[PDB]
Design a protein around this ligand. Structure first.
Ligand code: CA
Ligand code: CA
Ligand code: CA
Ligand code: CA
Ligand code: CA
Length: 1483
């Protein structure tokens, strides 16, 4: 396949769109400064915000969130810098001292696989001083997201998880952590070809921006060809995290300096990292520079094109440039330690290093110039072609550049055309460019193999779309051809070694492309063998991992010949432009090295320059040229007319009369051939909506050469069936048969919405190439007759539907129109000249029946600000359909009194060609004035076409969360924990019930929720014929309810929902201080419960443990929403997150999604069964609903469902402790293995929590945080359930120690009165921190050898959990906080021996820090205590007091000496004891 051409008016480049960056700075560490007061400043481009001030902390904590929003182009967003700085003593009076700064850019943060860095530590270096060392690190999370992106957020963990600096640096892949300094020389030499800005002179100077620094050269006053010869040096951290250098020529002025042009050097194209890579280098070579139009205007609206914001519409300058980096040793005292940008004199380079200036030649032939836009074509028009400054005759051999102006004639009401016919104007341009053709040839072979590969991937994507047989063989052939072209590029590009015009970048880029493309060829040859159908899609992605990087090869940073520009001018006022690259036009002998646009006629769509080329002004095209272009050496000009169609005869200018090889000013064609286009137009689907009713009036105009016709208008449909051909009679073309069959001409098809007057709104356009046939060839299969194909219409950037067409070009023969095929006349003869699509091309139709289950309608909005009372649904498929029964009142019952009804239509035989079914709800008000409430049409029927087939419950939560963590890590009692929406694993519970998303309004462009006017609930069943009896008995049991038998009841039923909110983690902070105060809000219908009375305070990871009961009247009250809210002391409360969980499909699924089913039964304790019915009654109800025999019972260990038997345990315990027999365990096992039923077998949800991502309307597609919750449904017409689960969040302990004596404590104090050494020994110890566990003993004054006597008892009461061995407490973070915050640490004790004084603080002598779970055992005597029991010797075992409960021993306390080791500075005899809270009151 892939006969369609891919042309788009709006590419990805140029269009500005909304981005935002979110930067949070969690904790700063390892900073430097004496009594410093840090503030973290975050800068993105031209703005910056500061955090709060912290006083005298070395490790401050901020956790402050910043969001920067911009609406800019993607390329200029990727060039914005990100600066994280730390400032000491910032104030407005005096500038604070800079501690450290870190530079980064937006574009490489976007280059992450998650478009973000999670928990990464910025290296806060010193940009102000190269010789200075590291100034600290700052942990941060930085994310870049624009509109239209869906991303997954990783675990936003606290300090209790991995937070180490070195393994989580703020680096991309492959960057070395030390980031050695470098000098970046750019060497601006010369320039040529400047325009006029004084009216007419210019005062240029080159300013270069990189990494937030800038440097400008001197100004060469009054010179259009200036010579700067100056070099600008930067210094930054190699490798540069910023990936672009903005070099910009500027015209200096005394009031407002403006821009000449701007070129962006992408540093990835000129560099390679690693030990096999090479340092950044470029040039000395010429760089082309494009911008706005060269003629001066005082109010130029295209000024931003000179700044690089968009696409250059004309050539503006050529700049000689060089670049070279070097790594400098910053420890050398020979060089100054400065950092700022410097401008010095550069070394002059000869022109022979960039290639000799040499004369090139451009030839162009304007064959066709049609579809000129009407609002400009009242004047005669021209076509000015300029390459470089050559051909700029308007602004200022004799080269010609313009076609002769002559008036445009009428084609239709929307476009003119130009009557060239046989007189084709031509242009010839002499030019002088350097001899760097080999660079363009290498980039051209790169682009040629990349174009072949991209054509292969688009072809196999089309065979994926149309389900053609074995695309894996096409993939293997594509990879083999890619390897063959790879070896061709290996054997081709290396033969021009002898020239000395190669720069420093040429050899390095050729070698790097050699190595990388050898790796690509061997990787493609290895990937060819593993291509398989069932894993084809990932293989496609691997091919994309080739192709884009191949384009990364093809982009040349040192382009020699500038792009050619083809313009339009009406009375010498510029209208529209096209810009063709010159690597595609260069002529050469080898076919892969030959340009893809050289010596062939190509279609070329002009467009408005700059900002007028975007949006609604850029809908209609400005011209559709059929241009022949050739570019190359004048000694290679021997065959620059060979690719042209034959039959032409030259006419030259006055200077070239009688010459041999003078290029012609014009051509006259004599070999005219007549043709006819049969524009087959069968259908369209999913078109754009251009009326306020949500539908349109589509009629399509077909444009071919100069003729244009329109198919008839159909009314109030987005999927029309015109059933019409457009006969363009007696076309004329010029050429021969072999130059036209493989390259047919272009047909452009636009669709318009007819309105109440003569104007018509726009739908977009598509393009086509007709099936071409000659007189000598016959109408043989499989080429003829042409089959209808799908043509993708694009309304600019956004897609706007498909189109059904079978275009064919047919030449007339020597017998005239008698050699034309027999035209099938109109069966409906009332249409007259409207001739339908003939047979063979028209899809052969067959009888189909559509049976529609009309279940209900949900949340329809107002029509003309009036409420909807009595809906009805019309259904249209292939023009005919059935209408639903009326409902009586929407507010009390939004359901139809009968459900199943059918209709008979004709549909095509193959399912790929099916027209879309269109449902339309309309209000049936009085007096027959029915208006459109909603419409849903875009659907494929393939899914509907039938074919015959001490423990608590938290311990159970821990025993499941660790298993799901183990399974997640191995991929990269117990409940089945689900990590996402339950709908994603259980296909939104759409077994028979389907939700069709119901639309009214114009289709959105550059949301669907604003178009939402409700949704339809129901099902479709479309089938050809009644099948044999065993298959058709599904409908044969009850024709009243049709094929949808097995349906459950439709009448309203009363229900309670029981929502359990377990916990939540990774909350986005509602408050700006990185904290939140969460509480659950729940809404369902009229019910809204907000539990503000039982909030959790100062928590981003709430342990909730809450259960709520909500009344609901189904089917109206089936739209539950669960949200988390933040308490605010003043003002209004701010929402944190909100999730939607609908209950219609959950209740009415076969999967039993009302309540989960546990792993096993227990009638007491932590595994209590919350559902009121036993599982025996549960599968009794499921067997009665699903037409299943069973359940059957025998002994208590077996249960029979259908023809299968399952097993399980027999006895079960209650709270009294005595066993009882039951068979409900085996019933629950049958519920677990319910998938094995041969007819009604599907999956069932187990008892779960779901980790639903909470979304926000402000950030679509972005998870603010994950919420652990699960819902239960219990219909109240069955008996009510009991007490809900005790999921409420949580043992208290007493640690007591006694210090008996001390020995060998170091005598720190010399005696003031007698002189001997002594020590006032006393003890101190604490578990948690300062304000809670600080206690000390009495002082043993004046020790002689370290002996002391205390006999003092400590006591530490606390809370504790043994699941993670964590001591549990909540305390205020600061004295200014409102209330307490929860903290977790492991079991710690810190013991110290001090030296008391009567007048000041005590002197530190010794310390130990031990764990109650793994401390080494104590000595038996004081003298047995040695150094080995405290250090890291493995010979000393460990004792846990949680199993021992009594420890007596001697233990050494260790000073903090300067030798980084431990020294015996004291011994302590200690008794250590553990009690509970109840035992502590009497022990
Ligand atoms: Ca309209
Ligand atoms: Ca209309
Ligand atoms: Ca708040
Ligand atoms: Ca708050
Ligand atoms: Ca003392």
């Amino acid at each position: 396949k892939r006969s369609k051409p891919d042309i788009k008016m709006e590419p990805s480049a140029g269009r500005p769109m909304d981005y935002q960056v979110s930067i949070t700075v969690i904790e700063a560490r390892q900073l430097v400064g004496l009594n410093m007061d840090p503030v973290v400043c975050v800068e993105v481009g031209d703005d910056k915000k500061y955090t709060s001030m912290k006083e005298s902390t070395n490790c401050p904590y901020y956790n402050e969130y910043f969001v920067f929003d911009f609406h800019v182009s993607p390329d200029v967003m990727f060039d914005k810098i990100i600066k994280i700085s730390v400032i000491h003593s910032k104030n407005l009076l005096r500038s604070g001292t800079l501690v450290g700064s870190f530079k980064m850019d937006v574009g490489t943060v976007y280059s992450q696989p998650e478009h973000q860095f999670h928990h990464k530590w910025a290296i806060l270096s010193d940009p102000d001083d190269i010789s200075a060392g590291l100034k600290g690190y700052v942990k941060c999370d930085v994310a870049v997201v624009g509109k239209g992106d869906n991303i997954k957020t990783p675990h936003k963990a606290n300090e209790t998880d991995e937070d180490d600096i070195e393994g989580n640096l703020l680096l991309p892949e492959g960057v070395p952590p030390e980031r050695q300094w470098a000098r970046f020389y750019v060497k601006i030499y010369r320039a040529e070809g400047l325009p006029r800005m004084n009216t007419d002179l210019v005062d240029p100077y080159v300013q270069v921006f990189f990494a937030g620094q800038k440097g400008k050269t001197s100004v060469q006053k009054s010179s259009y060809e200036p010579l700067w010869n100056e070099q600008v040096v930067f210094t930054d951290l190699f490798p540069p995290l910023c990936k672009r250098m903005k070099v910009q020529i500027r015209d200096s002025d005394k009031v407002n300096d403006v821009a000449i042009g701007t070129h962006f050097i992408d540093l990835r194209k000129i560099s390679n990292d690693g030990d096999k890579g090479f340092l950044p280098t470029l040039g000395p070579a010429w760089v082309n520079m494009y911008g706005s139009t060269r003629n001066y205007t005082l109010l130029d609206e295209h000024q931003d094109l000179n700044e690089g914001l968009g696409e250059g519409v004309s050539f503006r300058a050529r700049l000689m440039l060089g670049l070279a980096v070097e790594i400098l040793d910053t420890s050398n005292p020979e060089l100054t330690s400065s950092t700022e940008v410097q401008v010095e004199q550069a070394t002059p380079v000869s022109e022979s290093c960039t290639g000799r200036m040499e004369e090139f030649f451009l030839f162009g032939a304007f064959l066709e110039a049609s579809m000129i836009d009407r609002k400009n074509g009242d004047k005669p028009i021209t076509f000015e072609v300029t390459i470089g400054n050559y051909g700029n005759e308007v602004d200022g051999l004799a080269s010609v550049s313009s076609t002769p102006p002559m008036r445009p004639q009428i084609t239709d009401r929307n476009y003119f055309h130009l009557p060239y016919l046989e007189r084709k104007p031509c242009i010839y341009i002499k030019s002088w460019w350097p001899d760097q053709r080999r660079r363009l040839y290498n980039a051209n072979i790169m682009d040629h193999i990349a174009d072949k590969l991209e054509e292969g991937l688009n072809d196999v994507q089309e065979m994926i779309k149309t389900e053609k047989s074995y695309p894996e063989r096409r993939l293997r052939g594509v990879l083999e051809e890619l390897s063959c072209g790879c070896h061709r590029f290996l054997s081709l590009s290396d033969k021009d070694q002898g020239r000395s015009s190669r720069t420093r970048l040429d050899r390095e880029r050729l070698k790097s492309c050699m190595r990388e493309l050898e790796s690509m060829g061997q990787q493609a040859k290895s990937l060819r063998a593993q291509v398989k159908r069932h894993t084809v899609r990932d293989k496609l992605r691997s091919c994309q991992n080739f192709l884009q990087k191949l384009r990364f090869l093809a982009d040349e940073p040192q382009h020699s010949i500038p792009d050619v520009f083809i313009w339009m001018m009406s009375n010498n006022k510029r209208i529209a432009y096209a810009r063709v690259p010159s690597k595609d036009l260069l002529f050469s002998i080898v076919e892969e090295e030959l340009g893809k646009d050289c010596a062939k006629v190509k279609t070329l769509f002009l467009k408005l320059p700059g900002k007028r080329g975007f949006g609604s002004a850029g809908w209609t095209v400005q011209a559709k040229l059929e241009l022949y272009l050739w570019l190359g050496l004048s000694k290679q000009r021997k065959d620059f007319l060979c690719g042209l169609p034959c039959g032409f005869e030259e006419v030259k200018a006055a200077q070239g009369l009688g010459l041999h090889s003078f290029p012609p000013i014009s051509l006259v064609y004599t070999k005219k051939q007549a043709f006819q286009l049969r524009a087959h137009m069968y259908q369209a689907r999913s078109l754009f909506a251009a009326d306020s009713s949500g539908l349109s009036d589509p009629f399509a105009r077909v444009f071919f050469i100069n003729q244009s016709q329109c198919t008839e208008v159909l009314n109030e449909t987005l999927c029309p069936t015109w059933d019409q051909m457009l006969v363009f009679d007696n076309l004329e073309l010029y050429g021969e048969a072999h130059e036209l069959r493989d390259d047919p001409p272009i047909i452009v098809i636009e669709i318009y919405d007819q309105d109440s007057m003569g104007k018509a709104d726009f739908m977009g356009r598509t393009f086509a190439k007709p099936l071409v046939k000659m007189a000598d060839e016959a109408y043989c299969p499989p080429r003829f007759p042409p089959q209808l194909e799908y043509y993708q219409i694009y309304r600019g950037s956004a897609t706007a539907g498909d189109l059904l067409a079978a275009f064919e070009l047919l030449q007339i023969g020597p017998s005239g129109k008698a050699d034309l095929p027999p035209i099938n006349g109109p069966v409906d003869m009332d249409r007259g000249p409207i001739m339908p699509v003939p047979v063979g091309i028209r899809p052969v139709l067959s009888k189909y029946r559509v049976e529609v289950l009309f279940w209900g309608l949900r949340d329809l909005k107002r029509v003309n600000l009036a409420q909807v009372d009595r809906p009805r649904v019309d259904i249209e498929c292939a023009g005919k359909g059935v209408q639903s029964s009326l409902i009586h009142n929407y507010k009390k019952n939004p359901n139809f009194n009968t459900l199943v009804k059918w209709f008979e239509v004709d549909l095509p035989e193959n399912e790929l060609l099916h027209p879309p079914l269109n449902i339309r709800v309309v209000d049936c008000r009085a007096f027959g004035r029915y208006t459109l409430v909603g419409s849903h049409a875009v659907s494929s029927l393939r899914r509907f076409i039938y074919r015959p087939p001490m423990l608590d419950w938290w311990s159970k939560y821990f025993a499941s969360i660790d298993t799901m963590k183990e399974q997640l890590r191995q991929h990269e009692d117990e409940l089945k924990v689900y990590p996402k929406e339950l709908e994603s694993e259980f296909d939104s519970f759409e077994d028979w019930l389907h939700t069709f998303n119901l639309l009214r309004g114009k289709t959105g462009d550059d949301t669907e929720e604003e178009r939402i006017v409700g949704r339809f609930k129901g099902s479709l069943c479309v089938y050809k014929v009644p099948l044999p009896e065993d298959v058709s008995r599904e409908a044969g049991y009850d024709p009243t309810y049709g094929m949808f038998q097995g349906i459950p009841s439709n009448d309203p039923i009363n229900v309670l929902v029981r929502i359990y909110v377990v916990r939540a983690t990774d909350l986005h902070p509602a408050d700006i201080n990185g904290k939140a105060d969460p509480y659950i809000a729940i809404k369902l219908g009229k019910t809204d419960i907000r539990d503000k009375e039982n909030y959790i305070s100062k928590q981003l990871n709430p342990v909730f443990g809450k259960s709520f009961d909500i009344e609901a009247s189904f089917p109206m009250e089936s739209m539950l929403t669960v949200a988390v809210y933040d308490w605010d002391l003043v003002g209004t409360d701010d929402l944190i997150g909100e999730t939607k969980i609908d209950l219609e499909n959950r209740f009415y699924s076969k999967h039993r999604a009302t309540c989960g089913i546990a792993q096993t039964y227990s009638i007491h304790g932590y595994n209590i069964w919350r559902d009121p019915m036993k599982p025996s009654q549960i599968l009794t109800r499921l067997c009665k609903e699903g037409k299943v025999d069973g359940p059957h019972f025998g002994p208590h260990g077996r249960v029979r469902v259908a023809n299968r038997v399952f097993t399980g345990p027999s006895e079960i315990e209650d709270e009294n402790g005595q066993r009882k027999p039951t068979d409900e365990h085996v019933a629950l096992s049958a519920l677990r293995h319910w998938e094995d039923i041969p007819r009604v077998g599907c999956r069932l949800v187990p008892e779960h929590v779901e980790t639903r991502p909470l979304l926000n309307p402000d950030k679509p597609g972005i998870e603010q945080g994950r919420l652990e919750l699960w819902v239960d449904m219990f219909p109240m017409d069955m008996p009510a359930p009991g007490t809900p689960l005790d999921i409420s969040p949580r043992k208290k302990y007493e640690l007591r120690v006694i210090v008996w004596n001390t020995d060998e404590v170091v005598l720190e104090d010399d005696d003031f009165f007698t002189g001997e050494k002594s020590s006032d020994i006393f003890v101190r110890g604490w578990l948690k921190g300062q304000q809670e566990d600080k206690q000390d003993t009495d002082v043993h004054y004046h020790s002689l050898t370290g002996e002391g006597n205390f006999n003092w008892r400590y006591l530490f009461p606390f809370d504790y959990l043994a699941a993670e061995e964590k001591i549990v407490m909540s305390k205020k973070e600061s004295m200014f906080s409102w209330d307490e915050t929860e903290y977790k640490i492991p079991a710690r004790l810190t013991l110290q021996i001090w030296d008391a004084d009567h007048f000041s603080a005590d002197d530190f002598l010794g310390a130990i820090e031990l764990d109650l779970n793994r401390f080494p055992r104590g000595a038996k005597t004081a003298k047995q205590c040695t150094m080995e029991m405290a250090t890291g010797e493995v010979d000393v075992p460990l004792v846990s007091i949680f199993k021992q409960k009594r420890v007596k021993g001697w233990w050494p306390l260790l000073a903090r000496n300067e030798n980084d080791e431990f020294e015996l500075t004291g011994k302590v005899e200690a008794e250590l004891h553990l009690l509970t809270a109840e035992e502590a009151e009497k022990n």
